[PDB]
């Protein structure tokens, strides 16, 4: 069985109702990246930034938000491949988890987690973060921040990811824009180590020409159809 590494971006969750920085102008929920997606933004206006992620966290857990067919297809892929499958996502949502995927590497963190500003320890969290919420890991309880990797910060699980990139027989990028590094550079790593590279996207990423195989269209239709050939090619 081939070793498969899958990278997913915001495009896969778009059909589920989760939006991100628009291609047209880079605004996320009509907010500048710089104000809500940087360490500096958090420092100048912690009240606004905390409120922003409170809204995102609440929106994520609304009844009408569900994993779509593309999420489900990836869960089936892991079932079939087991240990030879690894899922890395740039998304902070939990739709991969809800779909049935396990050991998902959230390289940009998770919306449903917070982090101690003193220990750096992550903490499961589903509600609002108020100023009176503190950590549970320190003798002297510290303030909490979203467990989301901001621009200017180091992504998570990079060592595991680069190891899988060198081992992967097939690398599949799904719903990635190609604007966000180092994630956008993963396809170059995979191809360097002899992996077969595949892009599945609504629109061609800004590195789409580096992929050997590509299919474009709605994620909920393109991803399940690519996954099924693959499962059928396994026989």
């Amino acid at each position: 069985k081939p070793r498969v590494l899958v990278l997913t971006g915001a495009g896969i969750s778009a059909e589920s109702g989760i939006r991100t920085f628009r291609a047209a102008d880079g605004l996320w929920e009509e907010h500048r990246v710089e104000d809500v997606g940087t360490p500096e933004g958090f420092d100048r206006d912690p009240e606004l930034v905390q409120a922003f992620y409170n809204a995102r966290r609440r929106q994520l857990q609304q009844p009408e938000i569900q994993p779509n067919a593309a999420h489900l297809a990836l869960a089936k892929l892991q079932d079939a491949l087991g240990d030879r499958f690894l899922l890395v996502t740039q998304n902070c949502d939990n739709l991969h988890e809800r779909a049935g995927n396990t050991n998902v590497i959230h390289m940009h963190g998770e919306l449903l987690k917070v982090r101690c500003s003193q220990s750096g320890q992550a903490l499961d969290w589903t509600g609002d973060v108020t100023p009176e919420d503190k950590c549970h890991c320190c003798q002297f309880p510290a303030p909490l921040r979203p467990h989301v990797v901001w621009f200017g910060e180091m992504p998570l699980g990079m060592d595991e990811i680069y190891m899988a990139l060198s081992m992967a027989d097939i690398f599949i990028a799904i719903g990635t824009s190609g604007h966000v590094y180092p994630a956008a550079g993963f396809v170059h790593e995979a191809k360097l180590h002899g992996a077969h590279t595949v892009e599945l996207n609504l629109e061609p990423s800004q590195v789409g020409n580096e992929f050997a195989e590509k299919y474009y269209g709605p994620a909920s239709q393109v991803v399940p159809e690519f996954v099924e050939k693959l499962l059928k090619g396994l026989k």
């Binding site: 901001w150 621009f151 200017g152 910060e153 180091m154 966000v180 180092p182």
Partner: peptide, 10 residues
């Protein structure tokens, strides 16, 4: 791979 960054800086 370095820190999380966008291709466009300015």
């Amino acid at each position: 791979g370095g820190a999380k960054r966008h291709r466009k800086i300015l």
